[PDB]
Amino acid sequence: SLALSLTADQMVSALLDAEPPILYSEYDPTRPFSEASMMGLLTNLADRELVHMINWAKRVPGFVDLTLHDQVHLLECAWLEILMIGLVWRSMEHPGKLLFAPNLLLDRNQGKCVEGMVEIFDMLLATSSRFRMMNLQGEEFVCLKSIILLNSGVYTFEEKDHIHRVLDKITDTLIHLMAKAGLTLQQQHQRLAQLLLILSHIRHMSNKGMEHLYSMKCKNVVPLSDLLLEMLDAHR
Amino acid sequence: SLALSLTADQMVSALLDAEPPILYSEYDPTRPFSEASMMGLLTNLADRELVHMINWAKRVPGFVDLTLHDQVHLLECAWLEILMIGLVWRSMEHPGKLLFAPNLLLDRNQGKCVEGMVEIFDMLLATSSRFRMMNLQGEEFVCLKSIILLNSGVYTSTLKSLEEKDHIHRVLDKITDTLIHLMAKAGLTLQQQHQRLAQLLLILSHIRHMSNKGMEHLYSMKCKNVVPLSDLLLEMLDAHRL
Amino acid sequence: KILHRLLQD
Amino acid sequence: KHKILHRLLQD
Ligand SMILES: Oc1ccc(-n2nc3ccc(O)cc3c2Cl)cc1
Ligand SMILES: Oc1ccc(-n2nc3ccc(O)cc3c2Cl)cc1
Numbered sequence: 108s109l110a111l112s113l114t115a116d117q118m119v120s121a122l123l124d125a126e127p128p129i130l131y132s133e134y135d136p137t138r139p140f141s142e143a144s145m146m147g148l149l150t151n152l153a154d155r156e157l158v159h160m161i162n163w164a165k166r167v168p169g170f171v172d173l174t175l176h177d178q179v180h181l182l183e184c185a186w187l188e189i190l191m192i193g194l195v196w197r198s199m200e201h202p203g204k205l206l207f208a209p210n211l212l213l214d215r216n217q218g219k220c221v222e223g224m225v226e227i228f229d230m231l232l233a234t235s236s237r238f239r240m241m242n243l244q245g246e247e248f249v250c251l252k253s254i255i256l257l258n259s260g261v262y263t264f265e266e267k268d269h270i271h272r273v274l275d276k277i278t279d280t281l282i283h284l285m286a287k288a289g290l291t292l293q294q295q296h297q298r299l300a301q302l303l304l305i306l307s308h309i310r311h312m313s314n315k316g317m318e319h320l321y322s323m324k325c326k327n328v329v330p331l332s333d334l335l336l337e338m339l340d341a342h343r
Numbered sequence: 344s345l346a347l348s349l350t351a352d353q354m355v356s357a358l359l360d361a362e363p364p365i366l367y368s369e370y371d372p373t374r375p376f377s378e379a380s381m382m383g384l385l386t387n388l389a390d391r392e393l394v395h396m397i398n399w400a401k402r403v404p405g406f407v408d409l410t411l412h413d414q415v416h417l418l419e420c421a422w423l424e425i426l427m428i429g430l431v432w433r434s435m436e437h438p439g440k441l442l443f444a445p446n447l448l449l450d451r452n453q454g455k456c457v458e459g460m461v462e463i464f465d466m467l468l469a470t471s472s473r474f475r476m477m478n479l480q481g482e483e484f485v486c487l488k489s490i491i492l493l494n495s496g497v498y499t500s501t502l503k504s505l506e507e508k509d510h511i512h513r514v515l516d517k518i519t520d521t522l523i524h525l526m527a528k529a530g531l532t533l534q535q536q537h538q539r540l541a542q543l544l545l546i547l548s549h550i551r552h553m554s555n556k557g558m559e560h561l562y563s564m565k566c567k568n569v570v571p572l573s574d575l576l577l578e579m580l581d582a583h584r585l
Numbered sequence: 586k587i588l589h590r591l592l593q594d
Numbered sequence: 595k596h597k598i599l600h601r602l603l604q605d
Contacts, residue, residue: 161602178603233498258545259552262469271542278541279534292533293520299537300519301512303544304494310548311495314555334598397591414592575587 110168115283125166169273184260346404351524405514420496
């Protein structure tokens with residue numbers, strides 16, 4: 108295998124190169140929001156990001172070594188986690204706002220337009236605030252997102268041992284970045300821990316949002332693409 | 344905060360002394376299971392374990408420094424994670440079974456007696472298998488259970504809220520120092536130390552997931568009038584719907 | 586709230 | 595049998 112022989116510097120480069128583009132939303136900003144429109148914007152966006160997430164996943168070292176069925180399971184398990192950590196990252200330098208896209212920057216109070224949404228916004232905003240107080244770096248972000256891809260579904264499965272080897276390499280890469288940034292050993296271990304404990308909160312937010320998305324589908328507040336229904340269906 | 348001045352060895356020892364007892368279920372072995380009786384056993388057990396968890400949390404360094412309202416939120420957020428990690432710890436030495444209690448050891452085929460349960464059993468069993476593969480040690484288990492308590496609800500008013508958060512993060516950083524200390528003492532290399540720290544903390548993402556799922560499932564049993572929940576449990580459960 | 590009381594003991 | 599994800603992956 109070829110992902111097990113990458114260097115720390117080369118793991119970063121490969122992740123930085125695999126990054127998806129930042130997509131714009133269709134939103135016409137001359138008109139205000141309804142509950143149906145906002146939700147349509149969110150799901151339309153997510154549906155387009157999902158296509159590029161598949162391309163990005165295939166470029167994550169070691170992912171391409173897994174069976175097609177295993178790749179499917181991992182992406183089904185983690186897809187909304189991946190979208191949310193994306194969201195939280197780009198919202199990092201906009202305190203109080205979620206940057207869904209460059210032309211869709213939503214205040215905390217705009218989550219009230221959709222029933223049950225503001226609770227989700229609040230958790231997203233507190234995670235972004237956390238990123239900001241840690242001063243999360245781009246190189247660290249691409250490592251965390253990759254970890255989510257490989258970790259979240261790994262226990263719901265040789266296939267497992269390869270993933271855990273690739274995960275160890277990514278741990279090595281995170282530590283390498285912190286050792287390069289001048290952190291002491293004790294500070295490296297502490298930061299590594301702090302960063303990974305955020306993945307617990309991101310899991311919580313995905314689980315909550317999967318439920319909200321389900322409710323919005325049942326109540327029929329908005330039509331969902333076939334791809335999105337399928338990713339939603341995998342969790343139930 | 345005297346807890347911030349604890350060595351690693353004093354942290355371990357305090358956490359080990361704080362451990363709750365292993366409780367018995369009220370399982371009558373000469374009656375047939377139903378969906379209702381099995382859920383009854385699990386919630387009766389959960390309810391009695393909660394009282395011992397409240398007193399364990401008080402013994403976790405730094406926890407008593409927090410305000411009463413923050414202690415409430417932390418436990419309300421994390422109660423089922425904590426119960427579930429206990430259960431997966433207890434089930435380490437019993438492949439294919441969940442030792443809810445010494446008199447309540449269930450396999451996945453018994454989980455099928457309650458609708459929707461077998462999925463959750465399967466996640467719990469696979470986590471126990473991960474624990475066994477890793478050869479998770481009790482000292483590491485008590486550190487993880489404490490991290491769940493402090494971290495899970497930590498992100499849910501200037502100085503006031505901020506310095507409660509700072510304090511929690513200082514305690515969390517001490518538990519990290521303690522885990523590394525343990526692995527170093529056990530003779531793991533510098534690289535193995537950070538790799539294992541990572542592998543252990545990624546399990547908390549899986550435990551969070553299982554708690555989210557179990558809270559949904561419990562809510563559903565409640566809403567179908569399958570089992571009467573004690574007022575404590577009703578309050579704990581209702582914390583997640585508001 | 587029960588939890589609140591139990592924590593005071 | 596024909597999940598969209600499946601066919602998006604094998605491209
Ligand atoms: O990049 C994105 C695109 C979409 C979403 N997102 N977050 C949601 C939370 C609840 C919900 O019902 C739908 C959501 C979407 Cl879409 C999150 C990040
Ligand atoms: O020590 C315990 C005591 C109870 C439980 N538990 N796990 C559950 C999963 C679903 C559910 O509806 C109730 C559950 C309980 Cl109680 C888990 C560990």
